[PDB]
Amino acid sequence: PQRLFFAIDLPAEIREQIIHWRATHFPPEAGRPVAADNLHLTLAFLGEVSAEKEKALSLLAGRIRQPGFTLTLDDAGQWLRSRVVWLGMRQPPRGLIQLANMLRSQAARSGCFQSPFHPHITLLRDASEAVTIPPPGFNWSYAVTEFTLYASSFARGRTRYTPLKRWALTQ
């Protein structure tokens, strides 16, 4: 029984620019930085999932026939209630919203509690103070080619993400 979620990943090049930007614009006291390799955009969080339910949800995810799409990170902000600082998009691509909505619907149909989708990439956690939010860096834009089912585990004091399955988008 594992804590699962579907997510979209970032090319190493973009991840590197994001952490250089983050270091440049937020002092250590602004919050706890998410490790560069852990940067991602969650599509659907499934919570704890049995091996049997995982197999079923995976089969459903394999039904998805979604065209590849381009993701351009033009927005950033802070949500004080969950105490995170994130990167996002002013107008998320239709393909992203469609993919997330399908996976959340599949999850909901399968008894994995959901809720509205606000796609974002969390850069800092435990950000309890309002900080100045600069625009993101220039040209953080890339083709999304697939999505991935991850298992999340926590030890020790650290969150670890293990990829379980990937599904290509069409093109």
From Swiss-Prot:
Enzyme superclass (EC): hydrolase
Alphabetical keyword list: Hydrolase
InterPro entries from the UniProt entry: Cyclic_Pdiesterase, RNA_CPDase
GO molecular function: 2',3'-cyclic-nucleotide 3'-phosphodiesterase activity; RNA 2',3'-cyclic 3'-phosphodiesterase activity
Phenotype upon loss of function: Disruption abolishes ligase activity in cell lysates, but mutants grow normally under laboratory conditions.
Keyword field contains Transit peptide: no
Database matches in Gene3D superfamilies: Cyclic phosphodiesterase
Effect of residue 120 to A: Lack of CPDase activity
Catalysis: reaction(s): a 3'-end 2',3'-cyclophospho-ribonucleotide-RNA + H2O = a 3'-end 2'-phospho-ribonucleotide-RNA + H(+)
Residue ranges annotated as motif HXTX 1: 40-43
Motif HXTX 2 per UniProt: ranges: 120-123
Pfam families, sorted: 2_5_RNA_ligase2
Superkingdom assignment: Bacteria
Annotated phenotype, changing residue 125 to A: Lack of CPDase activity
Catalytic residues in the record: 40, 120
EC number: 3.1.4.58
PANTHER family given in the database record: RNA 2',3'-CYCLIC PHOSPHODIESTERASE
HAMAP family the UniProt entry points to: RNA_CPDase
Subunit structure: Monomer.
Family affiliation: Belongs to the 2H phosphoesterase superfamily. ThpR family.
Function: Hydrolyzes RNA 2',3'-cyclic phosphodiester to an RNA 2'-phosphomonoester. In vitro, can also ligate 5' and 3' half-tRNA molecules with 2',3'-cyclic phosphate and 5'-hydroxyl termini, respectively, to the product containing the 2'-5' phosphodiester linkage. This reaction does not require ATP and is reversible.
Annotated protein name in UniProt: RNA 2',3'-cyclic phosphodiesterase
Organism field: Escherichia coli (strain K12)
